[PDB]
Design an enzyme around this catalytic site. Structure first.
Site, short mmCIF file in Angstrom:
data_model
loop_
_atom_site.label_atom_id
_atom_site.label_comp_id
_atom_site.label_asym_id
_atom_site.label_seq_id
_atom_site.Cartn_x
_atom_site.Cartn_y
_atom_site.Cartn_z
N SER A 4 21.02 35.58 36.99
CA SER A 4 22.00 36.16 37.90
C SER A 4 21.39 36.44 39.26
CB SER A 4 22.58 37.44 37.30
OG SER A 4 23.56 37.15 36.32
N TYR A 7 21.52 33.93 42.06
CA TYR A 7 22.75 33.80 42.82
C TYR A 7 22.85 34.81 43.96
CZ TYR A 7 24.47 30.54 39.33
OH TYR A 7 24.63 29.44 38.52
N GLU A 34 25.37 31.51 29.18
CA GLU A 34 26.36 31.88 30.18
C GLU A 34 27.57 32.47 29.47
OE1 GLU A 34 27.50 28.78 32.83
OE2 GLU A 34 25.45 28.34 33.50
N1 LIG Z 1 26.58 34.93 39.45
C1 LIG Z 1 26.00 35.04 38.26
O1 LIG Z 1 25.38 36.06 37.92
C2 LIG Z 1 26.10 33.88 37.32
C3 LIG Z 1 25.52 33.99 36.05
C4 LIG Z 1 25.57 32.94 35.14
C5 LIG Z 1 26.19 31.74 35.47
C6 LIG Z 1 26.77 31.64 36.73
N2 LIG Z 1 27.46 30.61 37.35
C7 LIG Z 1 27.80 31.06 38.59
C8 LIG Z 1 28.57 30.25 39.55
C9 LIG Z 1 29.39 29.21 39.13
C10 LIG Z 1 30.17 28.51 40.04
C11 LIG Z 1 30.14 28.83 41.39
C12 LIG Z 1 31.04 28.17 42.38
O2 LIG Z 1 31.68 28.82 43.20
N3 LIG Z 1 31.12 26.83 42.32
C13 LIG Z 1 32.02 26.08 43.19
C14 LIG Z 1 31.32 25.58 44.44
C15 LIG Z 1 30.31 24.53 44.12
N4 LIG Z 1 30.52 23.23 44.23
C16 LIG Z 1 29.35 22.63 43.76
C17 LIG Z 1 29.00 21.29 43.61
C18 LIG Z 1 27.76 20.98 43.07
C19 LIG Z 1 26.87 21.98 42.70
C20 LIG Z 1 27.20 23.32 42.85
C21 LIG Z 1 28.45 23.63 43.38
N5 LIG Z 1 29.09 24.83 43.63
C22 LIG Z 1 29.30 29.85 41.82
C23 LIG Z 1 28.52 30.55 40.91
N6 LIG Z 1 27.39 32.30 38.82
C24 LIG Z 1 26.73 32.68 37.65
#
Ligand SMILES: NC(=O)c1cccc2nc(-c3ccc(C(=O)NCCc4nc5ccccc5[nH]4)cc3)[nH]c12
Ligand SMILES: OC[C@H]1O[C@@](CO)(O[C@H]2O[C@H](CO)[C@@H](O)[C@H](O)[C@H]2O)[C@@H](O)[C@@H]1O
Length: 238
Positions: free
Chosen positions: A132, A135, A216
């Site tokens: 986490s 991020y 996750e």
């Molecule tokens: N924050 C935690 O503590 C946390 C903890 C465990 C798993 C987690 N996954 C996320 C996560 C997922 C998705 C996104 C998200 O906006 N993607 C959409 C935008 C995006 N396009 C992409 C295309 C390619 C690669 C990455 C990309 N992210 C952000 C955080 N935060 C996590």
């Protein structure tokens, strides 16, 4: 301002006088004593669940805050007695927290793509503090970060080894668990007010055909999350 100095520091960190900014969060914020049992448990959770492959930095706890967002517990009621409630990590950029505390954690709108959402558009959590903390996108220049502990009502988990990219669960399923190779030692789990705290040191899960190194947890209803604590962390890079 009559607020404690740690709280004043937090307000300044995530932003006009200080008290109006505090009332802008619509959140009751208290300082958890450093010598309390709450603080000992949280420091243990941070100490034990740092992954080996996240060896780019060490985490040190500066301040622990107990947070109650206006109305959030009132809307978490439908899931308050739901089995399998876990205390989990959620990291995010400091710049985002002003929103997070005032609007709560939220789900991407329907028009947004599913690209980058490994398990669909939802609210993601981890049981490994480093996963986490990554991020927070903390830099060597500004080595201070913020991270949430949230009570997540996981209910019946849809356990998945590979990515799904959809946010629709089968009937009678309340969350998704992405199975990682490494999980906190479950025999070390404790219960802090009916809520599981997987603060065990990492061990192998036995899950073989998995694409994830660490677990996750994803819920797809904002009412399934109840933020409990907010941590301020010093990142110590090598
Ligand atoms: N924050 C935690 O503590 C946390 C903890 C465990 C798993 C987690 N996954 C996320 C996560 C997922 C998705 C996104 C998200 O906006 N993607 C959409 C935008 C995006 N396009 C992409 C295309 C390619 C690669 C990455 C990309 N992210 C952000 C955080 N935060 C996590
Ligand atoms: O198919 C979902 C399954 O779980 C329930 C629990 O009441 O709903 C949960 O899961 C859905 C996630 O996509 C959401 O519709 C809902 O908000 C969430 O609580 C049932 O409605 C259903 O049987």
């Amino acid at each position: 301002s009559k607020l404690p100095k740690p709280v004043q520091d937090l307000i300044k960190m995530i932003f006009d006088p200080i008290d109006v900014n505090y009332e802008k969060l619509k959140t009751d914020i208290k300082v958890v004593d450093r010598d309390s049992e709450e603080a000992e448990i949280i420091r243990k959770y941070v100490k034990n669940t740092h992954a080996t492959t996240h060896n780019a930095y060490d985490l040190e706890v500066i301040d622990i805050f107990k947070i109650e967002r206006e109305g959030e517990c009132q809307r978490y009621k439908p899931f308050k007695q739901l089995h399998n409630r876990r205390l989990l990590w959620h990291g995010s950029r400091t710049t985002n927290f002003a929103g997070i505390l005032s609007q709560g954690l939220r789900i991407a709108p329907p028009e947004a793509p599913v690209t980058g959402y490994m398990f669909g558009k939802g609210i993601y959590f981890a049981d490994m503090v480093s996963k986490s903390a990554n991020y927070c996108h903390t830099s060597q220049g500004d080595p201070i970060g913020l991270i949430l502990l949230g009570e997540v009502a996981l209910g019946n988990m849809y356990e998945l080894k590979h990515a799904s990219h959809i946010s629709k669960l089968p009937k009678g399923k309340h969350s998704v668990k992405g199975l990682g190779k490494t999980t906190p030692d479950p025999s070390a789990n404790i219960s802090l007010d009916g809520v599981d705290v997987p603060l065990g040191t990492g061990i192998s899960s036995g899950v073989n055909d998995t694409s994830l190194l660490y677990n996750e947890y994803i819920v797809y209803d904002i009412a399934q999350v109840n933020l409990k604590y907010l941590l301020k962390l010093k990142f110590n890079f090598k």
